[PDB]
From Swiss-Prot, chain B:
PTMs per UniProt: Ubiquitinated, leading to its degradation. Ubiquitination is promoted by HUL5.
Species assigned in the record: Saccharomyces cerevisiae (strain ATCC 204508 / S288c) (Baker's yeast)
Gene: RPN10
Official protein name in the record: 26S proteasome regulatory subunit RPN10
Keyword Ubl conjugation among record annotations: yes
Lineage: superkingdom: Eukaryota
Keyword field: Proteasome, Ubl conjugation
Whole-protein residues included: 1 to 197 of 268
Swiss-Prot record, chain D:
PTM: N-acetylated by NAT1.
Cell location: Cytoplasm; Nucleus
Organism listed in the record: Saccharomyces cerevisiae (strain ATCC 204508 / S288c) (Baker's yeast)
This protein's name: 26S proteasome regulatory subunit 6A
The family this protein is said to belong to: Belongs to the AAA ATPase family.
Entry function: The 26S proteasome is involved in the ATP-dependent degradation of ubiquitinated proteins. The regulatory (or ATPase) complex confers ATP dependency and substrate specificity to the 26S complex.
UniProtKB/Swiss-Prot annotation, chain E:
Signal peptide region: none
MPN domain mapped to chain residues: 4-138
Post-translational modification remark: N-acetylated by NAT1.
Species of provenance: Saccharomyces cerevisiae (strain ATCC 204508 / S288c) (Baker's yeast)
Miscellaneous: Present with 19800 molecules/cell in log phase SD medium.
UniProt similarity note: Belongs to the peptidase M67A family.
Function, as annotated: Acts as a regulatory subunit of the 26S proteasome which is involved in the ATP-dependent degradation of ubiquitinated proteins.
Protein name: 26S proteasome regulatory subunit RPN8
Curated annotation (Swiss-Prot), chain F:
Keyword Transmembrane listed: no
Gene Ontology terms: biological process: proteasome assembly; proteasome-mediated ubiquitin-dependent protein catabolic process; ubiquitin-dependent protein catabolic process
PROSITE patterns attached to this UniProt entry: PCI
Segments forming domain PCI: 187-355
Further comment: Present with 12400 molecules/cell in log phase SD medium.
InterPro entries hit by this protein: PCI_dom, PSD13_N, PSMD13, Rpn9_C, WH_DNA-bd_sf
Family that this chain belongs to: Belongs to the proteasome subunit S11 family.
Record keywords: Proteasome
A family per Pfam: PCI
SMART domains tied to this protein: PINT (SM00088)
Gene: RPN9
GO cellular component, one term: proteasome regulatory particle, lid subcomplex
UniProt name for this protein: 26S proteasome regulatory subunit RPN9
Summary of the function given for this chain in its UniProt record: Acts as a regulatory subunit of the 26S proteasome which is involved in the ATP-dependent degradation of ubiquitinated proteins.
Amino acid sequence: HRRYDDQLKQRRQNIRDLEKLYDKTENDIKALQSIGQLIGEVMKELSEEKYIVKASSGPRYIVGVRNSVDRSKLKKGVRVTLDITTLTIMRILPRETDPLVYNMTSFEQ
Amino acid sequence: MVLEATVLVIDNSEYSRNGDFPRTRFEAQIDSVEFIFQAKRNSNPENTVGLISGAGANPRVLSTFTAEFGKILAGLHDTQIEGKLHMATALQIAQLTLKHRQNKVQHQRIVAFVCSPISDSRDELIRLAKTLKKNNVAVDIINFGEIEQNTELLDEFIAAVNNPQEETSHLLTVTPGPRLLYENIASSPIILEEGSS
Amino acid sequence: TKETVYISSIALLKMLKHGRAGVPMEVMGLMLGEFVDDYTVNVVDVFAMPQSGTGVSVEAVDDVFQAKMMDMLKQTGRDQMVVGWYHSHPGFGCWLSSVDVNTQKSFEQLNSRAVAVVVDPIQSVKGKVVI
Amino acid sequence: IRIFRSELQRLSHENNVMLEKIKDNKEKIKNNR
Amino acid sequence: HEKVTIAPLVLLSALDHYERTQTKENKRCVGVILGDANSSTIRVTNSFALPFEEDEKNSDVWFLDHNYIENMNEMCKKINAKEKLIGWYHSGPKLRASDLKINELFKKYTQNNPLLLIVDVKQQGVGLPTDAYVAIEQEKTFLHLPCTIEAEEAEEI
Amino acid sequence: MFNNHEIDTILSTLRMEADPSLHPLFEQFEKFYEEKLWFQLSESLTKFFDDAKSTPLRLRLYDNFVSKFYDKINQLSVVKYLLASLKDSKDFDESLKYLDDLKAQFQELDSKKQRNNGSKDHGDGILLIDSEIARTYLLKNDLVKARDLLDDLEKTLDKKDSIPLRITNSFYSTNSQYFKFKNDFNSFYYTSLLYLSTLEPSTSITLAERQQLAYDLSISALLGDKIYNFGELLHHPIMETIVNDSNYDWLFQLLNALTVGDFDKFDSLIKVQISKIPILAQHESFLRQKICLMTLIETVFVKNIRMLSFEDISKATHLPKDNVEHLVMRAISLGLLKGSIDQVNELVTISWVQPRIISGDQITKMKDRLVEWNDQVEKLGKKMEAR
């Protein structure tokens, strides 16, 4: 009676403890296949769907947008996320070069 | 000893709202799955047991043929106690389940439980009995119902199929209450004994 | 005559979808169907393989994953004869895959008429569709 | 009596069912490193 | 609202399983769409068939293997991680009583509202050879979402 | 009928090992009601086909049998009948004394089996607590304090999703008498429409409650200016299931009253209760004109040109030119219509808003667009093709 009661609780606790560990492994391996992106800075505005930027990974390349990309917030000198394949602006990033939270001391309150 | 492929049928009906039978019900069907699987897979290799449900919410296939009963017990979980009753639906599903199967050229066997008198149609169940006879299908029917059940579509379904005993169908009646469910089935031709070819 | 590969509608689109992940990375696949020399050449179904740590080599293909998948080809009507192994590579001037050497020489032992297909442009896409 | 024995044997096999998922997940992380 | 985006890779893939299996008017090929239903734009980047069997005598009799459903979805994760279960597709020009009973199967492993797709090999009348519908209840209530087709750069060219 | 007097007793004296711990007061007090067929919450099986409004005197006994009901049939017998059927007792003296009884018993059921996945069945013990909360605080403290607790019930309906629709019915059941005692029956009319859409299997109702239900449905449409009119109640199987007199005929009298426009037929057959409020006579003028205002674009009229003068609308509404100008302005102000009004050229332009369920007059006029456009296919269409 009481012998199987102690093993019943120990069996259930071992399942829930290992379940959270196996769920993290399955979720982590799904993010390891994602494709990276490039980074560049806008030099001068060419046209609406066509821009002239300067990439940080190499020389300059003519770029553009893809879908649901805001073209109103894109100005000269604004750091943009460049696509590797299509070579277009995807995400929107602020303007920074050297880290300001490491080389520069940053503190709150 | 026993080399075959057996499909299990777990169904619910208007009479599934009970569970007074010894003290209970639906706990005997789950306990009967563990006895059938251990008497087959452990007896001889290449023994796979499937599980289908032709009642409750929707007449779907719970667990197909495999070597582990974990997915079989998972199919019994999250099942409506009270649901629609179609017995003849599960008969055609089990035939299509045995139609496409791994490791062909085996002995087809179907084990089903009686949760109700099964009044649907007369001539429809007659053609279903003669169809399974030409394909050499083993139909295992264990009658429960309320006390005794005779002169109905269940007896007419057996009389239109089985001339031969071990090669087609059998008959078994288990009485609720303090009775051994696995012992009466073990001595019965349903499990072990003969009928495996 | 020789064997002139005829690419079906789905055969061209899946090759671009299998090599969709990364410019530098690489995948593989198996061409299917049955055909006879002097005309008929056809590829019925194509399917990819998981990317391993060895890139593309004789140990890249997984016979365990292939056998488990091959059993699913029969029930769906997808089962055909394997006519070759198609790959995806970034491409070079000559010998577009530097890690692929000993594969085709082991492939010609089973069937001497089997070929191997690689998608050339991989971000170089033009619209003449050079493969 | 029968409740503690039936629930223990059920959760004992279901623990191995969860172990069947990581068996394939182990080969997934080894190939990506 | 939401819109259904069907890639040309999916539309041409469903047409292949019909001819190779020698499917007549008595059978309808069933398959599983793969994509992302989280956002308002539903895109299907992958499709595959399943060993489905149809019975016209009883609409409640269907043969579907759940083992091939979970295995193929897990094995195809190595290609792209953006492919999950957003629903399923089936063949045939019309919706019979057997289609309503099979709607609650994939809903167990599907988080958001599943998506239904009807592939027509004949394409008789007007446009839209593939119509998309959503399955939701308050009685089953189906709504027709706008059907658009958008592919990648190399796929459209 | 001996069904509940025998089968219920035989089941307890035979199955469930030996007895389900039977009390001596069970079979002793069961024969007091004889064959009169009052089973005092007949307890599942017999209760399914047999139901009445009789007040149970066993309330101090079967209330503790819930533990016996789990192994008996199902826990769903509590939400279908028994504790859920206590609303038919019409006993207001028990108020606030059944709160701890009808709550803590469900709190034990929620803390025992059901956690996330639970065991055996699913989808139980959710609306059981929420059903008795709104029915209690509706009495005693004023409706202002009762609405504060309805916000937690309203958020549950939008968030939680369950198969049974009792969650929707139980929330609007108390909310019905909220707007019934107050003014603004437009919100009460929209609530009254949500009770009956399609339920075949559920909501067991006899001819007694159908007349009580039709009362709240009818009164909702007296002052209600939205969503068609009383004819919607006739579209549902209600008027055929109730009596045709005793102030239940208001649907038949006010049906033609919105066409002929005679107020002496309805006001003569009613009492002084609803005739004292002048607002009731005002809303009857809106629905009378809305029938003709929907004909302005395409319903009946042939040429399909939208124009209305002050003389044509005055004869249709049986109102002078001064009162018809004010009636249209008040109709648009309530959100029923849109558009503008031209008094210089005597032109009335009203945008189409309120739909209608009528049909059969649009088939001929839709053919006009079919025939007139088909002539350009043979003439203009074949001219560009044969180019």
